Amino acid sequence: ASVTALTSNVSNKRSKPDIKMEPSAGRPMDYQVSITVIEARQLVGLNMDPVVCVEVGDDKKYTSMKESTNCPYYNEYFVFDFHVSPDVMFDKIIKISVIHSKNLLRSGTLVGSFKMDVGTVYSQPEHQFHHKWAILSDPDDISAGLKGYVKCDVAVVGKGDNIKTPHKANETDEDDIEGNLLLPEGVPPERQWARFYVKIYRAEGLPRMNTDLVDPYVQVFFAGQKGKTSVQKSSYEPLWNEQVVFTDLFPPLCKRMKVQIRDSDKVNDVAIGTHFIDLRKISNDGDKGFLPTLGPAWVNMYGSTRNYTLLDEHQDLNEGLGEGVSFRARLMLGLAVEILDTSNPELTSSTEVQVEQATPVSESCTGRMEEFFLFGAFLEASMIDRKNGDKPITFEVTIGNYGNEVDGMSRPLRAGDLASVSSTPPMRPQITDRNYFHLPYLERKPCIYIKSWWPDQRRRLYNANIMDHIADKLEEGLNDVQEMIKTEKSYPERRLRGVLEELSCGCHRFLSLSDKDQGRSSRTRLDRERLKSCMRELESMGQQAKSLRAQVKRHTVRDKLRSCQNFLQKLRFLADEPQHSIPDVFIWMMSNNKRIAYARVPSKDLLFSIVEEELGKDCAKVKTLFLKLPGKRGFGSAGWTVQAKLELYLWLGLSKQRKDFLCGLPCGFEEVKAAQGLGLHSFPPISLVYTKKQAFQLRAHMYQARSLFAADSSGLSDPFARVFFINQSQCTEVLNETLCPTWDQMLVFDNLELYGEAHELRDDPPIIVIEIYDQDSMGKADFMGRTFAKPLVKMADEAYCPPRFPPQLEYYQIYRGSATAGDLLAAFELLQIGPSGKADLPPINGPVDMDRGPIMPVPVGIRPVLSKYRVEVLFWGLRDLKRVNLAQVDRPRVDIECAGKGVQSSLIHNYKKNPNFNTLVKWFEVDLPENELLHPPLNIRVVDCRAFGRYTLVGSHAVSSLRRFIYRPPDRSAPNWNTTGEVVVSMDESMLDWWSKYFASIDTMKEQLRQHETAKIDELKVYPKELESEFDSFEDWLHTFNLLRGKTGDDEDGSTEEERIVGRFKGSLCVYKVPLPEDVSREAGYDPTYGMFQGIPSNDPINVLVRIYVVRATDLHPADINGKADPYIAIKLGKTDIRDKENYISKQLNPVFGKSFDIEASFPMESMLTVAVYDWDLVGTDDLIGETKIDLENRFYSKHRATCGIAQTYSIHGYNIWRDPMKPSQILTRLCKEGKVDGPHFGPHGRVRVANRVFTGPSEIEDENGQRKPTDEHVALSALRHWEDIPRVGCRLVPEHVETRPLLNPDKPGIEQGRLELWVDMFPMDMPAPGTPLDISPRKPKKYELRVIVWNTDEVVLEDDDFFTGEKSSDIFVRGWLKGQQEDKQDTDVHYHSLTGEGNFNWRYLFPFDYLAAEEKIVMSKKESMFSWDETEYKIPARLTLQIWDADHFSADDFLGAIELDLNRFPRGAKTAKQCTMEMATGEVDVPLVSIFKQKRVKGWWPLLARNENDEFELTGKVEAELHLLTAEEAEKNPVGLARNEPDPLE
Ligand SMILES: CCCCCC(=O)OC[C@H](COP(=O)(O)OC[C@H](N)C(=O)O)OC(=O)CCCCC
Ligand SMILES: CCCCCC(=O)OC[C@H](COP(=O)(O)OC[C@H](N)C(=O)O)OC(=O)CCCCC
Ligand SMILES: [Ca+2]
Ligand SMILES: [Ca+2]
Ligand SMILES: [Ca+2]
Ligand SMILES: [Ca+2]
Ligand SMILES: [Ca+2]
Ligand SMILES: [Ca+2]
Ligand SMILES: [Ca+2]
Ligand SMILES: [Ca+2]
Ligand SMILES: [Ca+2]
């Protein structure tokens, strides 16, 4: 590829800071874990009744009990719902266990368990595992072996996540367990046991917790286990030297460990601080990796404010559930992993959590204590919330507990006797405006200085600073590439190649810097191993960056960019230091000593170094901080207002390195120092008095906004924008009833004073805060959003000349919290008033409209150049207009306005009889910018026309981008438009049904979704998503515009976007430049009454028969207390509201409906199709599982012909019968007549000519009896299948299909909780009517009867011992069933007192059962319990179970052995009892497998196995059996009796 690259910034993203006002982390979000326990195999137990218990967090659910099987089958679906933050969510433990003998009084005996947290599932490629086997292990015994496997799906979805879900085909497979384990990639299939020594040494700096002492201990949580140390009573500096040892599998699938200091109290046990150790960050896998190690090193814990209160509203911060607002404690800590030798018998095999005495460590192992100096300079404090600032305001800086004056001296003491001044002097605020204050610092900036003592682990922070510097440059470069992609700047591939080259240079630079301290003795094992890992990963990263730079091309910019995103995330993951050294710096606003708002600067960001890459990104720089409310108060409505805005200079480093700690400040200040600092050059000042000052003038060219927040009940706003710069604020004018105001207003901040000649003021200007506000009637203003900007600084010596000046308008992203609230098209420049005064400034011109007066416009050269455009609007109709106020909408009219100009539609004089417009096409002319990116949005605004000029607003939609509707002149010289040149294109049955072709299409789709990851059945096209997702929503000529009314909801609660829809406007737009050329006009026709919209179909009402075929549903959300649902299909279309409550499928979460519903709807009025799934309830209302909206109006009028899908092949009989009443010849004739194509010209019956192309195919049809007639329909359907290749009006037609539409619940938004497979046919009733609906009803199971003649038994173990003489014997009888123990169990008579294991039975079982051949499942209908309302259909595997039992007269019968013959895959029986061995039933592949549905008679010997105390299989008996499968029709013709009875007796 090309080698040319760009290194510098081109796209001006640096003038748009992405300031996060809220922390944007730890926000709660709806999560869902769906777990489908499919089956289990090879479970360890004797006569076990296994129940799978599935826990996610604390909630646990159970499957049904399967009786007397070591390989049960469940196919049961569980859904766990949570509303928690992602860190809490991913720490939840998914535990899949198998228990037995559980009843109402006794907890079940545990067989085996599997542990894996939610975050392991979420880190999967599709956030899920599909068809994987959980390795069960004994969690209480390290010497125990494998306890079985549980095949299961585990999936995690957040709000708005999309998962490719595989379709539920017939799983008639014998897939390998060991090749499909439930483990992440890189984890070995056999996992050893290991011990996690969480050594806890001591803690320092604890706050008050009783009123006033504290009694701390440390509780450690790991993988669901917990253990705690002793309580060190009455100590702020506790000392434990105690290790908490967990025994768990390695490598652990629960990857976070929660260390938590707690205070012991008899009233309530309370948390002090919480730190999470990430095991990913302290370990590496593979042979080159290392075991999880940490320490002995300090760890910093953060939480609530340390002042004592009786009730703490920020107690969740002490639990680690949010960002900490104050320093709580620091804790020496270590972690070690020792892999246990499980074969060695000397150590104990128990797994319970030990608390032992750890070996104490010295303080010198963490690094020698060094004196750190922190300096601050509050250059500016503005934008303080007026709800607090009636009283004087201080700013207190604290690092650790140093400088915490108000909460007490919990500080050890480690210039001479320099007293730390950590708080600014109090000063009364002055009014900026009605919402904000500012402190009048002016020339006197207050300063702070804090002396602290920390261990000298600066090397960790330096390495993190280097790698975070590389990550910062990479993130800035990727934002540059994305922004120049979005604004369509030329050649983004050069910028991406330069970014990759710079990333490779930084990765090479890290390796030369990080090895300069290898000789340090105060260096943990984690430091050495992580340094080696980071060096290896960054060298591999530099090589991968060079390789990816070699692959960047023009068309491949958009897919190498996400490849660089995982580089960015790997640098961010590696850049976090798990061994904390210096705690973060906190800056707090106070008033009357009450803590109000905080900022938290990371300590490594302020650290000083000689090397530029080791230097922190905020060290010796003026940092813009936005203080926020602590805890949950910074979220939502309370966190909307800016609490404060600081320009805070900060420096941190050693006290030996503080010679240049004032170098980053603006020049021209005099240091005012305390009484201790008189005559001392090195003493830091308590304030700066600036003598230099520079006059400035900021111009805010606020031209336009778009897509703004709606803060009025009409769905609109009255937005005006307030611009904040330093200590001043100015407002634009209020524009009424719009969400896209064109203010066109320049705000001039005259004679500003910038104190001090700032270092690099051109490259780092002060930030501008822009706040939108909805003006209201009696005087308040709703917060409408906030964006940030950086002005283009023009110095006095600079010329106001291109290419830098005048600044162009750019879009600044507006936010309300975290939600996007539109864009602000504005430009900002910061012009210095020179020595000559204001004459050097560019001229300020008067307004074009003289009535505006003192309001200045955006000047020429900054405002966009306008050109004439014509917007042509098609007014197709208005659908589903909801009630405005209480009344109905009766005379609607559509006013469409763009950039002040506009047109109004014809008034619909009566909405009910015909919601249509008399004039279909109207147009207006409007000046729009040359740049298509700067085009203002077009507003659709439907009003209800009452009498006497009184209009009420029904709804409003904002078309944000007009570029979809922009008519460029099409290229008709392309070879696709060529219509000349001849092109030639060439081409046990009676048991098939629609399910045959459906399963064939499902298999074809399943292999087609695996192709890109690297007799014959005619098929259809199964879509994994909606049909709209394939055919671009059928919006080829007709578009939908959802009208909205009411206020937009908040980011957490309130209204939602789908609730605010009060109607739909049907129509299209076509925007083109004026004048349009005449040849372009005649290429598009341009009839004067239709404009650009040629080929528009008839607007008249037409009756349409809508036939909805509902096939099945998958993964339905449970809506009953038993974890299941009783789904039925409820379809709403127009006035027809079918609710099929009589045909519900009871207790099924994957129902097979097989239904068809006929609804006659008057199109285009009755066109919103709502197919819903409802859980039927015996008492109370039926619950909505989910629903989908299909919008048949787009389907009916589309050029894709979405009315009826066209089949792959044509026939008039059988499973592939042609559904459409219009034959393929008629469809081809209609498509040629509508498209004005010459044709279809049928010559001989095997060919047709459509335009320049000739199709050929078979020429004869089959009329159901083997006889043939000549026909034209095969070649017509071949032409219809290749209709996309037609040159002039060719189009990909909709095939016969089954679409998978997600089911959405408004009560549980954002999470898909169902997948309804369906398809919709539409037939106009003025055409000939279709026939009967297709029989897509589910397959009736074929009736069978399996006859199992148990002849004899041999070598049965003798269970009984004689009480008087002592010889062994056994009362052998055989127990057999096919469906279950409570439904098909039959026992032979007892062969009493067998002294050798030989039994003689000659006993015939009969097992009548219903069978589905495709699913290989026995179908049976039975009640779930005795107290149940209805019979439930169950599908179980066809498995014959034969068991040997010993009959006891005075006790229960004793289980001896069993075999579970799968009737499709059971081994062949041996010819004699001698040839029967252990290897037939176990995992040896050398024994061939036989299906009884093919062989139809198998006689032989089979082994019966039982597990002893050593958990191994042993041969406890052999049985001779004669399986003989018959149909029911064969069984009635040849009847036999039970046991030995007539007919066909047995001896
Ligand atoms: C007394 C026995 C209580 C047993 C526990 C209990 O509360 O059962 C509620 C039952 C079942 O209702 P659902 O299946 O919708 O609740 C399940 C829910 N949708 C979910 O999915 O969580 O309803 C009634 O008894 C009728 C109430 C209204 C009567 C007018
Ligand atoms: C012979 C007695 C029959 C009694 C039949 C009866 O009353 O059934 C109602 C329910 C059981 O109904 P389903 O679980 O099938 O719920 C149906 C569907 N899933 C729903 O959601 O509603 O009974 C109980 O809860 C305990 C009753 C104890 C009565 C002593
Ligand atoms: Ca206490
Ligand atoms: Ca309002
Ligand atoms: Ca308002
Ligand atoms: Ca229910
Ligand atoms: Ca129900
Ligand atoms: Ca209900
Ligand atoms: Ca016995
Ligand atoms: Ca006995
Ligand atoms: Ca017994």
Residue numbers in the entry: 238 to 448, 464 to 666, 693 to 1265, 1317 to 1343, 1398 to 1930
Paper text:
Otoferlin is a Ca2+-sensitive multi-C2 domain protein and belongs to the ancient family of ferlins involved in Ca2+-dependent membrane fusion processes.
(A) The high-resolution cryo-EM map of mouse otoferlin (216 to 1931) bound to a lipid nanodisc [comprising 30% PS and 10% PI(4,5)P2] and viewed from its N-terminal side. In the high-resolution lipid-bound structures, we could model nine Ca2+ ions (C2C: 1, C2D: 2, C2F: 3, and C2G: 3) of which six, bound to C2F and C2G, are part of the lipid interface of otoferlin. (F) C2F recruits two PS headgroups, originating from the nanodisc bilayer to its three Ca2+-binding sites. In contrast, both C2F and C2G are oriented toward the nanodisc membrane with their top surfaces, allowing for the aspartate residues of L1 and L3 to coordinate Ca2+ and engage the lipid bilayer directly through the bound ions, consistent with these domains playing important roles in late-stage SV exocytosis. The top loops of C2G are rich in aromatic residues [F1746 (L1), F1747 (L1), F1833 (L3), and Y1775 (L2)] and histidines [H1776 (L2) and H1832 (L2)], which all appear to either insert into the membrane or position close to it. Different from C2F and C2G, the Ca2+-binding top loops of C2C and C2D in the membrane-bound otoferlin structure point away from the nanodisc membrane (but see results of MD simulation below). The simulations reproduced the interactions between anionic lipids and the C2B, C2F, and C2G domains observed in the cryo-EM structure.
